[PDB]
Protein backbone atom coordinates (compact mmCIF):
# COMPACT_ATOMS: atom_id res chain seq x y z
CA UNK A 1 0.00 0.00 0.00
CA UNK A 2 2.83 2.41 0.95
CA UNK A 3 4.78 1.39 -2.21
CA UNK A 4 1.57 1.91 -4.28
CA UNK A 5 1.12 5.43 -2.78
CA UNK A 6 4.69 6.34 -3.92
CA UNK A 7 3.90 4.96 -7.45
CA UNK A 8 0.81 7.23 -7.88
CA UNK A 9 2.61 10.53 -7.04
CA UNK A 10 5.44 9.89 -9.60
CA UNK A 11 2.92 8.68 -12.27
CA UNK A 12 1.06 12.08 -12.35
CA UNK A 13 3.94 14.02 -14.07
CA UNK A 14 7.29 12.77 -15.42
CA UNK A 15 9.10 15.64 -13.63
CA UNK A 16 12.43 15.08 -15.36
CA UNK A 17 11.47 15.73 -18.96
CA UNK A 18 13.14 18.63 -20.72
CA UNK A 19 10.98 20.38 -23.27
CA UNK A 20 12.71 20.48 -26.67
CA UNK A 21 15.76 18.71 -25.23
CA UNK A 22 18.66 18.20 -27.58
CA UNK A 23 17.19 19.64 -30.74
CA UNK A 24 18.84 22.89 -31.71
CA UNK A 25 17.56 26.10 -33.27
CA UNK A 26 17.36 24.52 -36.76
CA UNK A 27 16.37 27.21 -39.24
CA UNK A 28 17.87 30.52 -38.25
CA UNK A 29 17.89 33.50 -40.57
CA UNK A 30 21.30 34.34 -41.97
CA UNK A 31 22.20 37.66 -43.56
CA UNK A 32 24.24 37.45 -46.65
CA UNK A 33 27.62 39.08 -46.02
CA UNK A 34 30.57 40.30 -48.06
CA UNK A 35 34.07 40.88 -46.71
CA UNK A 36 36.77 42.64 -48.67
CA UNK A 37 39.86 40.46 -48.16
CA UNK A 38 42.37 42.85 -49.82
CA UNK A 39 42.74 45.71 -52.37
CA UNK A 40 45.28 45.72 -55.27
CA UNK A 41 46.10 49.12 -56.88
CA UNK A 42 48.79 50.47 -59.30
CA UNK A 43 51.15 53.16 -57.89
CA UNK A 44 52.02 56.57 -59.49
CA UNK A 45 50.78 55.54 -62.98
CA UNK A 46 50.43 58.39 -65.55
CA UNK A 47 46.75 59.53 -65.32
CA UNK A 48 44.75 56.38 -64.38
CA UNK A 49 44.54 52.88 -65.95
CA UNK A 50 41.22 50.93 -65.78
Amino acid sequence: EGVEKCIYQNNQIDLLEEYFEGETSEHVVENLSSKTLMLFKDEKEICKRS
Binding site: G2, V3, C6, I7, N11
Partner: peptide, 15 residues
Protein backbone atom coordinates in the same frame (compact mmCIF):
# COMPACT_ATOMS: atom_id res chain seq x y z
CA UNK B 1 9.55 1.37 2.34
CA UNK B 2 10.24 -0.47 5.66
CA UNK B 3 7.29 -2.00 7.62
CA UNK B 4 8.09 -3.72 10.97
CA UNK B 5 11.20 -5.91 10.32
CA UNK B 6 10.51 -6.21 6.54
CA UNK B 7 11.80 -3.67 3.93
CA UNK B 8 10.91 -4.00 0.20
CA UNK B 9 12.19 -2.49 -3.11
CA UNK B 10 9.67 -1.44 -5.82
CA UNK B 11 10.82 -0.78 -9.44
CA UNK B 12 8.44 1.49 -11.45
CA UNK B 13 8.92 3.24 -14.84
CA UNK B 14 7.89 6.59 -16.38
CA UNK B 15 5.17 7.08 -18.99
Amino acid sequence: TQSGDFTMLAIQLCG
